[PDB]
Design a protein around this ligand. Sequence first.
Ligand SMILES: Nc1ncnc2c1ncn2[C@@H]1O[C@H](COP(=O)(O)OP(=O)(O)OP(=O)(O)O)[C@@H](O)[C@H]1O
Ligand SMILES: [Mg+2]
Ligand SMILES: [Mg+2]
Length: 350
Amino acid sequence: AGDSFMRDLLKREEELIGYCREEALKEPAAMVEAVTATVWPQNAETTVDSLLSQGERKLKLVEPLRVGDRSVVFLVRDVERLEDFALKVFTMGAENSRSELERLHEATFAAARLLGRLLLPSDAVAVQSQPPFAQLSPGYAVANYLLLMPAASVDLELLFSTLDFVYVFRGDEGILALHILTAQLIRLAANLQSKGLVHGHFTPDNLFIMPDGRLMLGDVSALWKVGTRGPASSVPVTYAPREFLNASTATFTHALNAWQLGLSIYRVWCLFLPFGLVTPGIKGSWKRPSLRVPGTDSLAFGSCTPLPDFVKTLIGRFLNFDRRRRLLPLEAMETPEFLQLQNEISSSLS
Ligand SMILES: Nc1ncnc2c1ncn2[C@@H]1O[C@H](COP(=O)(O)OP(=O)(O)OP(=O)(O)O)[C@@H](O)[C@H]1O
Ligand SMILES: [Mg+2]
Ligand SMILES: [Mg+2]
């Protein structure tokens, strides 16, 4: 800890992060406004039934936090436990949304039971007097299925867009934070590997710095035992290596997460993705939709924050296009480069 530095950094920039979080809610403000009124049509405090206990809970809106591709996540206060929670609400664009959410619920909580570094939901609730999972009234269709979980301080996607939106002088502290986040990402991916696990989206919208400064991975339903076959489409296309883009069914391998780790470290230092891949929310991004389509396939560091050579080497080995020759995170931790990374950090923190 390490973690402590990041905890303190996040606290000191709480106001800048809040500003950028508010800024990111403007393009999708239509969506946000409609969903808020669906869940809190009256006065900010809604009673819901738990789908796990048929206990009740009383949830007060504090503020919207983030919009996703298929959801809005709010900060809420459980007024009987005096604790804040993130609450994720799902939109129902997909024709089979209701069945998809019932499966997601069953899968998520069966996996969470088994387990008890992963950010897990602790409850799922539904507005009273309307059936669970069905479109929630008063109707941007929203499902009557609201997922309660610990609130992250920031997801990495927001951290990157915060770094991109406002130039802020951070001096040596900022550079140290880039080293620490790099080390934290490598240690989290190595923890997956040591357990023979692979996550389908080790991606910045699912990597979270919690209030204690620790990095966590969300969405347990997208964990796989290594070597398992599953739908390639479950990997976001800009974070998929070519071996995933080329099949309907793919094998979930450690090489996937080495690739995804390489992309996130590249974003820590560069904010946009490499290889010209489209990176919404970041100014420097090019517009290539995936590695399926031709483009520039060499690594470019010219527009990044200046990177240590040992970081460039690590990124380059994680992003080897040959899945057989791609460096894995546990082996990365035994390389001279990772040792230089650790020692840079240790000597700056002393
Ligand atoms: N527990 C949480 N605390 C804080 N922010 C969260 C939490 N869970 C999710 N978020 C953020 O909310 C946004 C939307 O969530 P997420 O990206 O998981 O959903 P999505 O985009 O709708 O679905 P998917 O990512 O699986 O396609 C993201 O910025 C994410 O990091
Ligand atoms: Mg997302
Ligand atoms: Mg998610």
